[PDB]
PDB file of C-alpha atoms and ligand atoms in Angstrom:
ATOM      1  CA  UNK A 243     -11.913  11.915 -22.013  1.00 22.37           C
ATOM      2  CA  UNK A 244     -12.620  10.822 -19.022  1.00 21.74           C
ATOM      3  CA  UNK A 245     -12.317  13.651 -16.083  1.00 18.68           C
ATOM      4  CA  UNK A 246     -10.523  12.528 -13.185  1.00 18.77           C
ATOM      5  CA  UNK A 247     -13.313  12.089 -11.108  1.00 20.34           C
ATOM      6  CA  UNK A 248     -14.838   9.300 -13.145  1.00 22.40           C
ATOM      7  CA  UNK A 249     -11.788   7.680 -13.949  1.00 23.45           C
ATOM      8  CA  UNK A 250     -10.903   7.331  -9.991  1.00 22.69           C
ATOM      9  CA  UNK A 251     -15.065   5.507 -10.502  1.00 23.56           C
ATOM     10  CA  UNK A 252     -14.072   3.354 -13.090  1.00 20.95           C
ATOM     11  CA  UNK A 253     -10.549   1.924 -11.492  1.00 23.94           C
ATOM     12  CA  UNK A 254     -11.370   1.953  -7.615  1.00 24.35           C
ATOM     13  CA  UNK A 255     -15.128   1.502  -7.642  1.00 24.60           C
ATOM     14  CA  UNK A 256     -16.990  -1.060  -7.059  1.00 23.28           C
ATOM     15  CA  UNK A 257     -20.628  -0.468  -5.265  1.00 22.18           C
ATOM     16  CA  UNK A 258     -22.616  -3.244  -7.188  1.00 20.74           C
ATOM     17  CA  UNK A 259     -20.390  -5.644  -4.860  1.00 21.85           C
ATOM     18  CA  UNK A 260     -20.599  -5.912  -1.201  1.00 23.89           C
ATOM     19  CA  UNK A 261     -17.167  -8.302  -1.134  1.00 27.19           C
ATOM     20  CA  UNK A 262     -15.528  -9.808  -4.001  1.00 25.14           C
ATOM     21  CA  UNK A 263     -17.553 -12.779  -4.776  1.00 23.79           C
ATOM     22  CA  UNK A 264     -15.074 -15.390  -5.795  1.00 23.78           C
ATOM     23  CA  UNK A 265     -11.341 -16.290  -6.866  1.00 24.89           C
ATOM     24  CA  UNK A 266     -11.176 -14.840 -10.299  1.00 28.61           C
ATOM     25  CA  UNK A 267     -12.693 -12.178  -9.325  1.00 26.62           C
ATOM     26  CA  UNK A 268     -10.226  -9.757 -10.002  1.00 27.54           C
ATOM     27  CA  UNK A 269      -9.268 -11.241 -12.908  1.00 25.05           C
ATOM     28  CA  UNK A 270     -12.820 -10.815 -13.838  1.00 25.80           C
ATOM     29  CA  UNK A 271     -13.470  -7.118 -13.417  1.00 24.63           C
ATOM     30  CA  UNK A 272      -9.746  -6.257 -13.937  1.00 25.59           C
ATOM     31  CA  UNK A 273     -10.640  -6.917 -17.648  1.00 27.44           C
ATOM     32  CA  UNK A 274     -13.697  -5.797 -17.435  1.00 26.68           C
ATOM     33  CA  UNK A 275     -12.247  -2.849 -16.211  1.00 31.00           C
ATOM     34  CA  UNK A 276     -10.487  -2.151 -18.804  1.00 30.12           C
ATOM     35  CA  UNK A 277      -7.938  -2.620 -16.108  1.00 31.43           C
ATOM     36  CA  UNK A 278      -5.334  -5.297 -18.695  1.00 29.63           C
ATOM     37  CA  UNK A 279      -5.847  -3.353 -22.952  1.00 29.98           C
ATOM     38  CA  UNK A 280      -2.589  -3.125 -22.742  1.00 31.73           C
ATOM     39  CA  UNK A 281      -0.469  -4.650 -20.502  1.00 31.56           C
ATOM     40  CA  UNK A 282      -1.529  -6.709 -17.250  1.00 33.30           C
ATOM     41  CA  UNK A 283      -2.082  -3.659 -14.232  1.00 31.04           C
ATOM     42  CA  UNK A 284       0.279  -5.174 -11.746  1.00 32.53           C
ATOM     43  CA  UNK A 285      -2.214  -4.446  -8.626  1.00 32.31           C
ATOM     44  CA  UNK A 286      -5.576  -2.575  -8.409  1.00 30.42           C
ATOM     45  CA  UNK A 287      -7.946  -1.699  -5.225  1.00 30.59           C
ATOM     46  CA  UNK A 288     -12.102  -1.961  -5.879  1.00 33.01           C
ATOM     47  CA  UNK A 289     -13.399  -0.368  -2.293  1.00 35.75           C
ATOM     48  CA  UNK A 290     -17.062  -2.050  -2.014  1.00 38.40           C
ATOM     49  CA  UNK A 291     -19.218   1.254  -0.658  1.00 39.77           C
ATOM     50  CA  UNK A 292     -21.653   3.741  -1.127  1.00 41.08           C
ATOM     51  CA  UNK A 293     -20.196   6.328  -4.230  1.00 43.29           C
ATOM     52  CA  UNK A 294     -20.483   9.104  -1.433  1.00 41.54           C
ATOM     53  CA  UNK A 295     -19.520   6.645   1.235  1.00 43.13           C
ATOM     54  CA  UNK A 296     -16.413   7.674  -0.293  1.00 47.93           C
ATOM     55  CA  UNK A 297     -16.470  10.641  -1.652  1.00 43.62           C
ATOM     56  CA  UNK A 298     -16.894  11.447   2.323  1.00 41.23           C
ATOM     57  CA  UNK A 299     -14.267  10.449   3.345  1.00 42.12           C
ATOM     58  CA  UNK A 300     -12.865  14.091   1.645  1.00 44.09           C
ATOM     59  CA  UNK A 301     -13.850  15.830   4.753  1.00 40.91           C
ATOM     60  CA  UNK A 302     -12.416  13.045   7.093  1.00 38.56           C
ATOM     61  CA  UNK A 303      -8.980  12.569   8.556  1.00 38.72           C
ATOM     62  CA  UNK A 304      -7.033  14.625   6.734  1.00 42.38           C
ATOM     63  CA  UNK A 305      -2.946  12.889   6.603  1.00 38.17           C
ATOM     64  CA  UNK A 306      -0.192  12.890   4.396  1.00 34.33           C
ATOM     65  CA  UNK A 307       0.025  11.398   0.660  1.00 38.56           C
ATOM     66  CA  UNK A 308       2.794   9.035  -0.670  1.00 36.95           C
ATOM     67  CA  UNK A 309       4.108  11.892  -1.943  1.00 35.81           C
ATOM     68  CA  UNK A 310       4.201  14.253   0.475  1.00 34.99           C
ATOM     69  CA  UNK A 311       1.347  16.436  -0.588  1.00 36.78           C
ATOM     70  CA  UNK A 312      -1.757  16.711   2.279  1.00 38.81           C
ATOM     71  CA  UNK A 313      -4.499  16.514  -0.149  1.00 39.58           C
ATOM     72  CA  UNK A 314      -5.192  13.053   1.286  1.00 37.25           C
ATOM     73  CA  UNK A 315      -8.016  11.591   3.803  1.00 38.10           C
ATOM     74  CA  UNK A 316      -8.061   9.057   5.698  1.00 40.27           C
ATOM     75  CA  UNK A 317     -11.411   6.755   6.428  1.00 40.52           C
ATOM     76  CA  UNK A 318     -13.048   7.405  10.310  1.00 42.39           C
ATOM     77  CA  UNK A 319     -14.021   3.342   9.202  1.00 41.87           C
ATOM     78  CA  UNK A 320     -13.020   0.335   7.904  1.00 39.26           C
ATOM     79  CA  UNK A 321     -14.325  -0.233   4.792  1.00 41.54           C
ATOM     80  CA  UNK A 322     -14.762  -3.224   2.590  1.00 44.20           C
ATOM     81  CA  UNK A 323     -12.478  -3.554  -0.518  1.00 40.80           C
ATOM     82  CA  UNK A 324     -10.554  -6.170  -2.407  1.00 39.96           C
ATOM     83  CA  UNK A 325      -6.912  -5.859  -3.884  1.00 38.96           C
ATOM     84  CA  UNK A 326      -5.689  -7.644  -6.234  1.00 39.66           C
ATOM     85  CA  UNK A 327      -2.506  -8.227  -7.328  1.00 38.72           C
ATOM     86  CA  UNK A 328      -0.482  -9.103 -10.599  1.00 40.27           C
ATOM     87  CA  UNK A 329       0.098 -13.868  -9.876  1.00 42.41           C
ATOM     88  CA  UNK A 330       3.958 -14.448 -10.803  1.00 44.26           C
ATOM     89  CA  UNK A 331       2.066 -16.862 -13.857  1.00 42.86           C
ATOM     90  CA  UNK A 332       1.190 -14.166 -15.526  1.00 42.88           C
ATOM     91  CA  UNK A 333       1.585 -12.927 -18.831  1.00 43.42           C
ATOM     92  CA  UNK A 334       0.013 -10.851 -20.824  1.00 43.34           C
ATOM     93  CA  UNK A 335      -3.062 -11.072 -22.472  1.00 41.36           C
ATOM     94  CA  UNK A 336      -4.045 -13.479 -20.298  1.00 41.70           C
ATOM     95  CA  UNK A 337      -3.261 -11.664 -17.125  1.00 40.43           C
ATOM     96  CA  UNK A 338      -3.335 -13.263 -13.823  1.00 40.30           C
ATOM     97  CA  UNK A 339      -4.319 -11.961 -10.198  1.00 38.87           C
ATOM     98  CA  UNK A 340      -4.080 -12.431  -6.697  1.00 36.59           C
ATOM     99  CA  UNK A 341      -8.186 -11.883  -4.877  1.00 33.16           C
ATOM    100  CA  UNK A 342      -7.583 -10.770  -1.301  1.00 37.12           C
ATOM    101  CA  UNK A 343     -11.183  -9.270  -0.014  1.00 35.80           C
ATOM    102  CA  UNK A 344     -10.863  -7.288   3.406  1.00 33.32           C
ATOM    103  CA  UNK A 345     -12.134  -4.589   5.452  1.00 34.00           C
ATOM    104  CA  UNK A 346      -9.430  -1.337   6.357  1.00 33.00           C
ATOM    105  CA  UNK A 347     -10.078   2.137   6.063  1.00 36.42           C
ATOM    106  CA  UNK A 348      -9.270   3.481   2.801  1.00 34.94           C
ATOM    107  CA  UNK A 349      -6.557   6.872   2.538  1.00 32.53           C
ATOM    108  CA  UNK A 350      -7.563   8.586  -0.682  1.00 31.19           C
ATOM    109  CA  UNK A 351      -6.435  12.153  -2.927  1.00 29.87           C
ATOM    110  CA  UNK A 352      -9.125  14.687  -3.551  1.00 30.07           C
ATOM    111  CA  UNK A 353      -9.032  17.260  -5.519  1.00 27.53           C
ATOM    112  CA  UNK A 354     -11.523  20.609  -7.095  1.00 27.03           C
ATOM    113  CA  UNK A 355     -15.105  21.739  -6.453  1.00 28.50           C
ATOM    114  CA  UNK A 356     -16.680  19.306  -5.549  1.00 28.34           C
ATOM    115  CA  UNK A 357     -13.594  18.355  -3.815  1.00 29.54           C
ATOM    116  CA  UNK A 358     -13.911  14.289  -4.797  1.00 28.59           C
ATOM    117  CA  UNK A 359     -11.690  11.279  -4.370  1.00 27.49           C
ATOM    118  CA  UNK A 360      -9.229  11.026  -7.473  1.00 23.37           C
ATOM    119  CA  UNK A 361      -6.952   8.413  -6.874  1.00 25.23           C
ATOM    120  CA  UNK A 362      -7.079   5.900  -4.446  1.00 25.25           C
ATOM    121  CA  UNK A 363      -3.542   5.624  -2.305  1.00 25.21           C
ATOM    122  CA  UNK A 364      -3.932   3.231   1.192  1.00 23.94           C
ATOM    123  CA  UNK A 365      -5.785   0.819   2.324  1.00 22.05           C
ATOM    124  CA  UNK A 366      -4.493   0.652   5.760  1.00 24.49           C
TER     125      UNK A 366
ATOM    126  CA  UNK B  14      28.008   3.525   0.892  1.00 23.65           C
ATOM    127  CA  UNK B  15      25.502   1.293   2.604  1.00 24.37           C
ATOM    128  CA  UNK B  16      24.506  -1.814   0.805  1.00 23.32           C
ATOM    129  CA  UNK B  17      20.406  -2.376  -0.105  1.00 22.19           C
ATOM    130  CA  UNK B  18      20.643  -5.586   2.445  1.00 22.64           C
ATOM    131  CA  UNK B  19      21.552  -3.230   5.199  1.00 27.35           C
ATOM    132  CA  UNK B  20      19.462  -0.343   3.897  1.00 31.59           C
ATOM    133  CA  UNK B  21      16.800  -2.293   3.800  1.00 28.63           C
ATOM    134  CA  UNK B  22      16.606  -3.428   7.360  1.00 33.39           C
ATOM    135  CA  UNK B  23      16.977   0.214   8.736  1.00 32.65           C
ATOM    136  CA  UNK B  24      14.757   1.387   7.065  1.00 34.32           C
ATOM    137  CA  UNK B  25      11.913  -1.749   7.639  1.00 34.94           C
ATOM    138  CA  UNK B  26      12.996  -3.707   9.990  1.00 31.52           C
ATOM    139  CA  UNK B  27      12.422  -3.914  14.413  1.00 28.77           C
ATOM    140  CA  UNK B  28      13.192  -7.222  15.115  1.00 30.12           C
ATOM    141  CA  UNK B  29      13.651  -6.101  18.624  1.00 33.63           C
ATOM    142  CA  UNK B  30       9.624  -5.592  19.160  1.00 33.78           C
ATOM    143  CA  UNK B  31       6.856  -8.152  18.789  1.00 36.06           C
ATOM    144  CA  UNK B  32       4.468  -4.330  18.207  1.00 36.45           C
ATOM    145  CA  UNK B  33       4.662  -1.096  18.628  1.00 33.53           C
ATOM    146  CA  UNK B  34       4.903   0.171  22.174  1.00 35.06           C
ATOM    147  CA  UNK B  35       2.849   2.791  22.154  1.00 32.97           C
ATOM    148  CA  UNK B  36       0.648   4.804  20.194  1.00 34.29           C
ATOM    149  CA  UNK B  37       4.318   7.109  19.954  1.00 35.88           C
ATOM    150  CA  UNK B  38       5.877   3.936  18.622  1.00 39.26           C
ATOM    151  CA  UNK B  39       6.099   5.520  15.130  1.00 38.86           C
ATOM    152  CA  UNK B  40       6.857   9.626  15.838  1.00 37.56           C
ATOM    153  CA  UNK B  41       9.576   7.703  17.806  1.00 40.25           C
ATOM    154  CA  UNK B  42      11.144   5.356  15.579  1.00 40.70           C
ATOM    155  CA  UNK B  43      10.671   7.201  11.976  1.00 41.94           C
ATOM    156  CA  UNK B  44      13.498   9.474  13.705  1.00 42.21           C
ATOM    157  CA  UNK B  45      15.791   7.075  14.889  1.00 43.79           C
ATOM    158  CA  UNK B  46      16.430   5.073  11.889  1.00 44.16           C
ATOM    159  CA  UNK B  47      17.334   8.706   9.884  1.00 43.45           C
ATOM    160  CA  UNK B  48      13.849   8.966   7.859  1.00 44.26           C
ATOM    161  CA  UNK B  49      13.109  12.412   9.185  1.00 44.67           C
ATOM    162  CA  UNK B  50      16.268  14.337   8.623  1.00 48.46           C
ATOM    163  CA  UNK B  51      16.082  16.228   5.512  1.00 46.28           C
ATOM    164  CA  UNK B  52      11.884  16.243   5.359  1.00 47.05           C
ATOM    165  CA  UNK B  53       9.338  14.051   6.960  1.00 45.48           C
ATOM    166  CA  UNK B  54       8.879  10.567   4.826  1.00 48.49           C
ATOM    167  CA  UNK B  55       5.635  11.036   4.462  1.00 51.87           C
ATOM    168  CA  UNK B  56       5.010   6.318   4.850  1.00 51.55           C
ATOM    169  CA  UNK B  57       7.357   3.457   6.487  1.00 52.22           C
ATOM    170  CA  UNK B  58       6.534   0.553   7.036  1.00 53.44           C
ATOM    171  CA  UNK B  59       8.304  -1.476   9.776  1.00 55.24           C
ATOM    172  CA  UNK B  60       7.998  -6.011  10.792  1.00 53.70           C
ATOM    173  CA  UNK B  61       7.823  -6.948  13.994  1.00 54.61           C
ATOM    174  CA  UNK B  62       9.883 -10.955  12.670  1.00 56.44           C
ATOM    175  CA  UNK B  63      13.132 -11.688  13.066  1.00 57.08           C
ATOM    176  CA  UNK B  64      15.041 -11.998  10.084  1.00 59.41           C
ATOM    177  CA  UNK B  65      15.111 -14.624   9.312  1.00 61.25           C
ATOM    178  CA  UNK B  66      11.696 -15.000   9.590  1.00 62.89           C
ATOM    179  CA  UNK B  67      11.987 -11.984   7.113  1.00 60.80           C
ATOM    180  CA  UNK B  68      14.853 -13.014   4.251  1.00 59.11           C
ATOM    181  CA  UNK B  69      12.000 -16.418   4.173  1.00 59.02           C
ATOM    182  CA  UNK B  70       9.496 -14.369   1.684  1.00 61.33           C
ATOM    183  CA  UNK B  71      12.049 -14.280  -0.883  1.00 60.77           C
ATOM    184  CA  UNK B  72      11.138 -18.172  -1.739  1.00 60.28           C
ATOM    185  CA  UNK B  73       7.118 -18.201  -0.557  1.00 58.44           C
ATOM    186  CA  UNK B  74       4.065 -16.769  -3.002  1.00 57.81           C
ATOM    187  CA  UNK B  75       5.501 -14.768  -6.685  1.00 56.55           C
ATOM    188  CA  UNK B  76       3.810 -11.686  -7.130  1.00 57.10           C
ATOM    189  CA  UNK B  77       4.342  -8.523  -9.690  1.00 53.89           C
ATOM    190  CA  UNK B  78       5.751  -5.344  -7.669  1.00 54.17           C
ATOM    191  CA  UNK B  79       3.641  -1.778  -8.136  1.00 52.58           C
ATOM    192  CA  UNK B  80       6.616  -1.434 -10.761  1.00 53.96           C
ATOM    193  CA  UNK B  81       5.355  -4.025 -12.458  1.00 50.64           C
ATOM    194  CA  UNK B  82       8.109  -6.530 -12.089  1.00 51.72           C
ATOM    195  CA  UNK B  83       8.889  -9.999 -10.846  1.00 51.42           C
ATOM    196  CA  UNK B  84      10.242 -10.346  -8.007  1.00 52.40           C
ATOM    197  CA  UNK B  85       8.584  -9.523  -6.151  1.00 50.28           C
ATOM    198  CA  UNK B  86       6.854 -12.065  -2.845  1.00 52.41           C
ATOM    199  CA  UNK B  87       3.978 -12.636  -0.363  1.00 46.89           C
ATOM    200  CA  UNK B  88       4.341 -14.470   2.827  1.00 48.59           C
ATOM    201  CA  UNK B  89       1.862 -17.460   3.302  1.00 50.17           C
ATOM    202  CA  UNK B  90       1.073 -16.637   6.599  1.00 50.90           C
ATOM    203  CA  UNK B  91       0.724 -12.571   7.887  1.00 47.66           C
ATOM    204  CA  UNK B  92       3.931 -11.187   9.854  1.00 43.50           C
ATOM    205  CA  UNK B  93       3.685  -8.315  13.583  1.00 45.00           C
ATOM    206  CA  UNK B  94       3.671  -4.889  10.890  1.00 42.09           C
ATOM    207  CA  UNK B  95       3.859  -1.097  12.031  1.00 43.72           C
ATOM    208  CA  UNK B  96       2.233   1.031   9.593  1.00 45.92           C
ATOM    209  CA  UNK B  97       3.357   4.821  10.374  1.00 48.50           C
ATOM    210  CA  UNK B  98       0.902   7.171   8.167  1.00 47.32           C
ATOM    211  CA  UNK B  99       2.186  11.186   8.385  1.00 44.49           C
ATOM    212  CA  UNK B 100      -0.170  13.794  10.043  1.00 47.05           C
ATOM    213  CA  UNK B 101      -2.304  16.510   7.671  1.00 46.76           C
ATOM    214  CA  UNK B 102      -0.612  18.488  10.934  1.00 46.91           C
ATOM    215  CA  UNK B 103       2.768  17.303  11.109  1.00 49.65           C
ATOM    216  CA  UNK B 104       5.232  20.469   9.716  1.00 49.86           C
ATOM    217  CA  UNK B 105       9.089  19.631   9.611  1.00 53.36           C
ATOM    218  CA  UNK B 106      11.228  19.248  11.992  1.00 53.23           C
ATOM    219  CA  UNK B 107       8.566  18.354  14.031  1.00 56.79           C
ATOM    220  CA  UNK B 108       7.438  15.030  12.396  1.00 56.74           C
ATOM    221  CA  UNK B 109       4.560  13.273  13.231  1.00 57.59           C
ATOM    222  CA  UNK B 110       3.241  10.133  12.735  1.00 55.08           C
ATOM    223  CA  UNK B 111      -0.062   7.887  13.203  1.00 53.50           C
ATOM    224  CA  UNK B 112       0.740   4.865  14.182  1.00 56.89           C
ATOM    225  CA  UNK B 113      -1.638   1.452  13.526  1.00 54.98           C
ATOM    226  CA  UNK B 114       0.120  -1.813  14.358  1.00 55.56           C
ATOM    227  CA  UNK B 115      -2.289  -5.306  12.539  1.00 54.49           C
ATOM    228  CA  UNK B 116      -1.005  -8.824  11.629  1.00 56.65           C
ATOM    229  CA  UNK B 117      -0.821  -8.740   7.907  1.00 57.75           C
ATOM    230  CA  UNK B 118       0.595 -10.530   4.900  1.00 55.47           C
ATOM    231  CA  UNK B 119       3.889  -9.298   3.155  1.00 56.87           C
ATOM    232  CA  UNK B 120       5.246  -8.074   0.452  1.00 55.75           C
ATOM    233  CA  UNK B 121       8.959  -7.639  -0.547  1.00 54.96           C
ATOM    234  CA  UNK B 122      11.548  -7.208  -3.660  1.00 56.26           C
ATOM    235  CA  UNK B 123      14.369  -8.954  -3.150  1.00 56.25           C
ATOM    236  CA  UNK B 124      17.818  -8.845  -5.569  1.00 57.26           C
ATOM    237  CA  UNK B 125      21.021 -10.663  -5.164  1.00 58.48           C
ATOM    238  CA  UNK B 126      23.334 -12.718  -4.146  1.00 54.60           C
ATOM    239  CA  UNK B 127      22.170 -14.231  -1.807  1.00 58.84           C
ATOM    240  CA  UNK B 128      18.763 -13.254  -1.741  1.00 59.99           C
ATOM    241  CA  UNK B 129      16.962 -11.215  -0.149  1.00 59.82           C
ATOM    242  CA  UNK B 130      14.744  -8.434   0.736  1.00 57.11           C
ATOM    243  CA  UNK B 131      15.667  -4.670  -0.564  1.00 55.04           C
ATOM    244  CA  UNK B 132      12.093  -2.993  -1.401  1.00 55.15           C
ATOM    245  CA  UNK B 133       9.589  -2.873   1.198  1.00 55.95           C
ATOM    246  CA  UNK B 134       6.908  -3.078  -1.784  1.00 55.09           C
ATOM    247  CA  UNK B 135       3.454  -3.320   0.816  1.00 56.33           C
ATOM    248  CA  UNK B 136       1.496  -5.442   3.819  1.00 54.89           C
ATOM    249  CA  UNK B 137      -1.842  -7.022   2.703  1.00 52.11           C
TER     250      UNK B 137
HETATM  251  C1  ADT C 158      -6.535   4.025  -9.541  1.00 52.84           C
HETATM  252  C2  ADT C 158      -5.819   5.120  -8.645  1.00 52.84           C
HETATM  253  O1  ADT C 158      -5.379   6.028  -7.567  1.00 52.84           O
HETATM  254  N1  ADT C 158      -4.242   4.608  -8.711  1.00 52.84           N
HETATM  255  C3  ADT C 158      -3.006   6.181  -8.417  1.00 52.84           C
HETATM  256  C4  ADT C 158      -2.573   5.748  -6.830  1.00 52.84           C
HETATM  257  C5  ADT C 158      -1.111   6.664  -7.369  1.00 52.84           C
HETATM  258  N2  ADT C 158      -0.899   8.278  -6.107  1.00 52.84           N
HETATM  259  C6  ADT C 158      -1.399   8.714  -6.499  1.00 52.84           C
HETATM  260  C7  ADT C 158      -1.391  10.561  -5.780  1.00 52.84           C
HETATM  261  C8  ADT C 158      -1.853  11.485  -6.547  1.00 52.84           C
HETATM  262  C9  ADT C 158      -1.951  10.066  -5.721  1.00 52.84           C
HETATM  263  O2  ADT C 158      -0.937  11.534  -3.864  1.00 52.84           O
HETATM  264  N3  ADT C 158      -1.302   8.766  -3.780  1.00 52.84           N
HETATM  265  C10 ADT C 158      -1.296   8.026  -5.000  1.00 52.84           C
HETATM  266  O3  ADT C 158      -1.064   6.966  -4.437  1.00 52.84           O
HETATM  267  O4  ADT C 158      -1.622   6.904  -7.804  1.00 52.84           O
HETATM  268  C11 ADT C 158      -2.123   6.403  -9.355  1.00 52.84           C
HETATM  269  C12 ADT C 158      -2.404   7.764 -10.348  1.00 52.84           C
HETATM  270  O5  ADT C 158      -1.352   8.117 -10.187  1.00 52.84           O
HETATM  271  C1  ADT C 159      12.184   1.537   2.270  1.00 54.02           C
HETATM  272  C2  ADT C 159      11.372   0.501   1.066  1.00 54.02           C
HETATM  273  O1  ADT C 159      11.614   0.216   1.055  1.00 54.02           O
HETATM  274  N1  ADT C 159      11.343   1.778   0.334  1.00 54.02           N
HETATM  275  C3  ADT C 159      10.725   1.641  -0.895  1.00 54.02           C
HETATM  276  C4  ADT C 159       9.168   0.936  -1.180  1.00 54.02           C
HETATM  277  C5  ADT C 159       8.999   1.267  -3.093  1.00 54.02           C
HETATM  278  N2  ADT C 159       9.068   0.402  -4.061  1.00 54.02           N
HETATM  279  C6  ADT C 159      10.836  -0.327  -4.822  1.00 54.02           C
HETATM  280  C7  ADT C 159      10.508  -1.011  -5.797  1.00 54.02           C
HETATM  281  C8  ADT C 159      12.053  -1.520  -6.343  1.00 54.02           C
HETATM  282  C9  ADT C 159      10.095  -2.164  -5.430  1.00 54.02           C
HETATM  283  O2  ADT C 159       9.690  -3.165  -6.263  1.00 54.02           O
HETATM  284  N3  ADT C 159       8.488  -1.894  -5.040  1.00 54.02           N
HETATM  285  C10 ADT C 159       7.904  -0.450  -3.612  1.00 54.02           C
HETATM  286  O3  ADT C 159       6.713  -1.161  -2.776  1.00 54.02           O
HETATM  287  O4  ADT C 159      10.473   2.300  -3.323  1.00 54.02           O
HETATM  288  C11 ADT C 159      11.301   2.475  -1.862  1.00 54.02           C
HETATM  289  C12 ADT C 159      12.026   1.540  -2.757  1.00 54.02           C
HETATM  290  O5  ADT C 159      13.266   3.469  -2.693  1.00 54.02           O
END
């Protein structure tokens, strides 16, 4: 029942924080965003910028997405992001993640009218 | 009839250089390693480290792979990498890429006997 855009926000936006607070950031967020519900989602990235700032990427540098289609866009500037990666030890339902904070360019897949981010392609 | 190990070396290893020479590195390498043969491969990463240093990652930090498997490992130290991303104006056969040189941790998938990298999962 969520739109593609609402789904993108749930999964990948964390405007409320400038950066991953601690080593436990991912353990907390993966769970509160419902990404640990039926199974441990293995990888996920949260962007720490305003929604408008992220929506603006859809008119920035046009690039190929991982699938070869060209509805992907690379941000002009670096953005604050947190990478969450399931660790070796992790066992549903006690899903465990490694938290990495970085300043990188983002690449998103855009769709619709208005043209907004619907998928997180990669960080560079 | 190429081995998984040899395919990983051809598509993801560039030990002969410490880093991407120029802005043109990706255009040249994607073509020489045959990744632009029938189509423009949209994304690719090259690691500028010795084979020995990359094979050693198979015994470093165990993490989940993108696909959920648990035969993935993250290097403890950053390594010299080159990110290749197909631009929005690229049209086969004139595949065009954007070159990004950086120092990042790598995540590889390992298999076989001996236990070596066979797939490049991501850089972090
Ligand atoms: C949270 C999220 O965006 N997951 C995405 C990433 C990946 N994806 C899909 C498309 C269509 C693309 O162009 N590039 C990507 O990286 O798929 C998940 C959704 O299926
Ligand atoms: C050159 C290369 O490694 N391509 C890989 C990237 C991706 N992949 C596969 C597996 C099995 C994995 O665990 N993690 C990945 O990122 O798919 C290509 C394999 O054809």
